[PDB]
Subunit: 506 residues, 4 copies
């Protein structure tokens, strides 16, 4: 086992509790009616409290348990938990979690003897839950046990599915909530595992409060049956249609909970799964694009003080594009056109970047981008995901650049480890407590929990759901920095500056 012992007094231990002091330095900027920036620094001290005792088993309830991500996840955990080696064309492979930052990436702790960089495992600084400690279950509008889910999905090697057959067969998703009007038609017959059935087994959108109670009961039951204390709920099911945000309906907490009791039309399944989890007090992550997190719902999250994070899983084509686009502005290149294309076979941003650079995107030179996306359905590819993106930037003196990003991989294989990270991090956050510190008054204040809306998880979410007034930040590399810096911080380590003065300077 690997661990780090940071020798600092900025933090101490008191009963599986790590207490760290930290001086958060920022700066406020102003502008003069003549073009000037008046930067006034800011400082604010805190004391962070990390509950060192992590759960021995972490509950995981997936909405879409039978899909590609859902089945693959369980597959992975089981495989890894049991060291279920498997056969392939390349021979017997050992199971792993490649693609997981939390589980495979490293972080620089500082320099060694010879002034050279030293890295450690992302999870070797502070105690995080091992995905091998996940106790996974969930819901799905389809009853197929997880082995049939694997067969159907076609993501994992045939030999591996067979070695997992025995156990994966015993895992059957709980009946879920189905409201037909919220998803693409082709999911009709797929639904044969619904908790919402009228007096005669017929999907009925009426009685949504009865449904809200069920999911909640479901969570409570999943917990006691597994002797678990902690559980997180992650939505990874078909994308619902966007829901309209209208005053009187879901604008406030009261109006949302009401609409649920009135069986309102703007109340969706995820809204119910979301509302439940929160009232149940368990973190809820929205791995899909729809806007289940309406203002009224958010208020509930804040009131109950329960974690939430969401809006899509940022993977492959979407990451590799965030890095490519950023990089092109960090060099002062103006990417004009951007053709993006997709197409899979299974049952499945630049505006902020174009705003950070004003010498490229102003009024005289221009500030527009012809970005046209595309995800056609080429079923004849199973889970193989081909993704082409081409940027046609502008160079000095009339020249142009033309960069292409051709991508091809088993999508749900990248998605699973990403889902794993979201859970490992959100569970870790459920143990971080912080207290603001008055410089002129000792131990003033009571420890608090992260503001409900956990934005630290954005590195994995495509549309970071931020709190009101705050504009989202999609810079992928930046997103990771906040993560490591935050962990660095928690053990008494400074934020990376990359200055290297024990080399730049005599």
């Amino acid at each position: 086992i690997t661990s780090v012992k940071v020798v600092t007094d900025k933090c101490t231990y008191k009963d599986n509790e790590l207490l760290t002091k930290y001086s958060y330095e920022n700066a406020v900027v102003t502008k003069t009616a003549s073009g000037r920036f008046d930067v006034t620094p800011t400082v604010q001290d805190y004391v962070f409290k990390l509950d060192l005792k992590k759960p021995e088993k972490l509950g995981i309830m997936l909405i879409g348990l039978g899909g590609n991500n859902g089945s693959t996840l369980v597959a992975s955990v089981l495989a890894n938990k049991h060291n279920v080696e498997f056969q392939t064309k390349e021979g017997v492979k050992q199971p792993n979690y490649f693609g997981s930052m939390t589980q495979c990436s490293t972080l620089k702790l500082g320099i060694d003897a010879e002034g050279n960089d030293v890295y450690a495992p992302f999870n070797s600084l502070l105690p995080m839950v091992s995905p091998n400690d996940f106790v996974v279950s969930g819901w799905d509008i389809n009853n197929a046990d997880l082995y049939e889910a694997m067969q159907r999905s076609q993501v994992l090697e045939y030999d591996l599915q067979q070695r997992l057959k025995a156990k994966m067969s015993l895992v059957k998703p709980l009946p879920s909530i189905y409201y037909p009007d919220f998803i693409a038609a082709n999911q009709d017959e797929r639904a044969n595992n619904c908790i919402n059935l009228d007096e005669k087994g017929n999907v009925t959108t009426r009685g949504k409060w009865t449904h809200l109670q069920r999911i909640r009961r479901d969570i409570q039951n999943f917990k006691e049956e597994n002797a678990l204390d902690k559980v997180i709920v992650l939505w990874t099911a078909n994308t619902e249609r966007y829901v309209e945000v209208s005053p009187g309906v879901n604008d406030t907490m009261e109006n949302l909970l009401q609409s649920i009791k009135n069986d309102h039309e703007e109340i969706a399944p995820s809204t119910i799964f979301a509302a439940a989890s929160i009232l149940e007090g368990v973190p809820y992550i929205n791995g899909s694009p729809q806007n289940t997190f309406v203002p009224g719902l958010v208020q509930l999250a804040e009131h109950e003080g329960t974690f939430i994070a969401g809006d899509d899983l940022k993977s492959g084509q979407t990451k590799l594009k965030s890095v490519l686009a950023q990089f092109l502005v960090d060099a002062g290149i103006k990417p004009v056109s951007i053709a993006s294309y997709n197409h899979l076979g299974n049952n499945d941003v630049i505006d902020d970047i174009i705003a950070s650079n004003d010498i490229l995107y102003n009024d005289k030179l221009g500030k527009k981008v012809d970005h046209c996306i595309v995800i056609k359905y080429m079923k004849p590819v199973g889970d193989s995901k081909v993704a082409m993106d081409e940027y046609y930037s502008e160079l000095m003196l009339g020249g142009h650049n033309r960069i292409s990003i051709h991508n091809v991989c088993e999508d749900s294989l990248l998605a699973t480890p990403l889902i794993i990270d979201l859970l490992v991090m959100t569970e870790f956050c459920t143990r971080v407590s912080y207290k603001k510190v008055d410089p002129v008054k000792e131990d003033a204040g009571k420890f608090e929990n992260f503001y409900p809306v956990l934005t630290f998880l954005s590195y994995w979410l495509k549309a970071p759901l931020t709190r009101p007034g705050f504009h989202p930040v999609n810079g992928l590399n930046k997103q990771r920095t906040a993560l490591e810096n935050f962990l660095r911080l928690l053990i008494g380590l400074p934020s990376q500056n990359e200055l290297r003065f024990e080399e730049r300077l005599l």
Copy 2:
């Protein structure tokens, strides 16, 4: 276009900036049982930045008649004189697109609502504009820069014509041609060399007199144009690597002597370099050859002058660097990298790169010659990584652009950043002895300029990081500290916290 930060770490005399700075870091040690013991370290500093920048910066490029040279000049002239040009897409306004110092911006902090506030890279402190560049230089071929431009075929013909008049005035100085360090297929060009004999013929004998002629060239340039500040940058055909041997080039003592003896390990770039450092002028080497031999490094130290760091960073290697890094950040193991071009991290993550899995990566470089593509280069980089549970990932990067349109702004950046580091001197003060000690300037090797160089040069014992993101982060954080701001943390605690 100006940043006025209110901190007590900065005080201004008469065109001089003084800044306090608590530099933090940490030393790590993996115990026997693989347990990292890390000890934090803080070192206080005081930097001095001469606020009076040169009103005109002198630039001498070796290989001024090439693609990069002529394009650099044309850009300066074009921008400086706002010369617009005609194209199929209509009239265009010149610019320095691609230049980080000219077209990039930085995050100063947040505004009232908690949103990010950005400002131009150059807007913080004062830096010299490329419009204030006075450019000259050497070249074994003597074609005036119009002809150099025509010959390069990288710039629009209408623009090329509009600059004809001024570009014609610029003619490169004769250079040192040691035919043994290039390719004899580079003899048609060599009609402008100083190193000649009585038979008029080119010669490799009399290297010290050649060296003195370059010094002369620099003085003449400075006086002739009435300049105080001049910078030299190599952007000429790559040279064959020279062997570093004792008693010849291992010391600045032997070096100056081997140059007097005409030693076979003394290359043209070796002369230009030494001739530049002797004239106290900075020297950037934008080619792969190892000019900065050890002995040559001492001379720079002794003379207290600046030196660069091997080969101009290509746009492909910029991306390969950025992207390949991103793969390891995600936890994905790129077991293969079969890339190859042509034209007219295993040390970071060891969880995937260890003697348990696979500490190796299939890499190969392939640049070929295809005269017809013109200045337009094409680059292909295929990445084959393995995912969890037997899966694999295949990513390809296709790139096409006129190389020079990318090297030029990158050259401008280096020049603007060297000139900057020129007006920066620091002092390592202790908290147990205020204002004690004299100011030294940046170590001879301006390692801060590794963002624009493929093979970063270094001070022995240390491995240079090639991570572009971090190579830009370091630089960005330097500007910040210099004006009292701290290193970006990205923690956004006024949003993540109550």
Copy 3:
């Protein structure tokens, strides 16, 4: 000048008339109720009459004269006709017709002394019109003279446009016919050159017969003003919406001409330009995808005995795909998925291949293809056309192939020479006459003209319009073969067999 003197008696000369005899051998195939093919050969002799005296100037009337193709065409002719060298980054270039089969490709005449292949220019066998002999004019719903058309188009080098400025400025398209309901909205204001205006300059779809007469008068006037004898009309304007084929309307000749007089709703501009040309007796080529050639219209073509050819211009991405797809079946590979994408910035098949191979596409193995096309609008590319096509075929024993075709070029630059070929060939066809020959009776029969619907031109058209009962053939390579073989034929040369027995055999 290059020419070929074929020493054969299969043909002789009589007053600028080349008379060639030819024995066309084919074979009829049958199938047995047990799986067998009863192939019974066929022979039929003919005498071809080629009118050797080609027109000194060929009239060309383009519908879309102001578009990219229209302007570029005139540009090219003028440039080439006058040897208008021009400046570029690569220096002074000489004008040419690269991309033109008719003008640049070669054909094998046979072997030399040493048994090695000998090729000659596609136009060096029989006399064809030089595009430098084109007298171009036309119509367009926009008045911009052709120089403004060039500027607007942005296809040609800036320096070349300037050297052509003088002359191109004097070329202004004739007013055209505009029926708003037949095209994408964005062509509204673009229309300021219309012949159809009510009592007060307002586009009116009424009086279509008045319009029919105009175009006809237009053609007659274009001819006499240029002292021309021959003229061809090529449609290269915005794509109209498809027209419904309904009985009583355009099913027969009588019903079509009637609907025009009744100002019918299913009568489109091209229908009128098409009907006119035909009644005027000039070949009409449809360079666009719409179905202007309805049955009723076709009947008129046959009755008047006037040439017609049509339905889209087959270029780049569409050719290179016809060759790629064919080739994959000629090797017995089954291409399953096929992702095709496009996107330009200007004002702008497998079913038969999957039917020729029954060992790959049957009922047990399957006979489907997930072909999804795409042409998004990335205006920020001028005329640069990026085209990506990716095929995911199947190999023996579960393996797969993945081939990509990345294409990028100035589209209208490929289109122009293609348009040139269509005209050179159709004009050449207007001089080929043929007489069937009775083996047991001398000089029986009167010479005839190709059946109206000229299918020889398909090598350039995407959807070959064939006569009733006949299924179209899209095999590009095959299409060219018929062209060379036909020319070979006309000078007394056998069809290529590639047998090479003076090498395969002792």
Copy 4:
């Protein structure tokens, strides 16, 4: 599955086919003033096709333990025994996808309505099925073919297991290993060689005895399995080119002697070839090396035996050949072709390729080694052509597939087509002397098999066409004439004419 054509050019005796054929062509001559004078030429022939095909064809592959070898075997077994296998996409049925003879079809003519009628390639005349293949062969490494299969990693693991039992039975024969013609990094494999000495060690001395051992191997194979027809195909690691010199390999006389003298220009493939021709067995060479030296060609002529034509045609070069041709058919000048791979027409059109424009094309071959990609190869071919009026075209071809899955069916095709040409003898009759003369068989070099070979072999004085379309057209037209049908004309006169 059977074609019965009704023509008078074909008559059938007792398992013998006789066909009349008027072969037409023409001789051209460019006069002084560049005017082609063409004189047509007709030559009558009479072909004889032995209608009785072997009930079991013998196959001996040199390098039977490689990727191609083991895959060839596995396919035959899989197909022959209808062994289905499991995959992520579910159960699959074996097949010979990719094989032209097995999965391609031909146009026989048109039906009632005037539409094209197609029939399987093999359906016309009778050809041997790959299911009737009895395969054996040599290999310097002695791993049984299961292990060879495991080692190759080209076939699905479930399929691989399902064939384990039968594949294990197949073990390659010892081969001739002259370490000097390959790569010493090929010594770990060589644990199965016949050419040994008393110190047991491998030796290059005694080449004639090695040659006699191969003959022995062939006889033993034929008798052991009770076969009359056997074919040999080289599919082993490429050999270093050998120099053709007089008095050593310029004649079949010198050749058989140099082989007796142990000459340094006698390679293993040189032995297998000669040993094959001496046993009267056909020999296909699917590697680049020039085994078929001149002297070795004479032996084949004298013995009246068949020989192949250098290197198995890759799927990339198949496309490069097809596509590049298509460009010249359109009139587009591909002034550049910067292509390159890696893994685990200027003579036709002279209107663009003349000393007025540019008779040159930027071409370069680049195959590299990237162990990790597995059997999956990736190919990139970029084409930069010029269009009319200063424009340009850039086309790229990306290709990824498991090479062997493409070489195997191509190998099967060659084998099925050689066996076919084996039962074909012709006669050159005159119209001025009926039934006069004896039947000869296809010239030693089966040039009809250039569709599946990169570097077509030839009879001196003639340049082989590499145009795949035409290389397939020639073949297709042969089947046709053999059964009375004429060469495809594509004139479709029953539609184009009234």
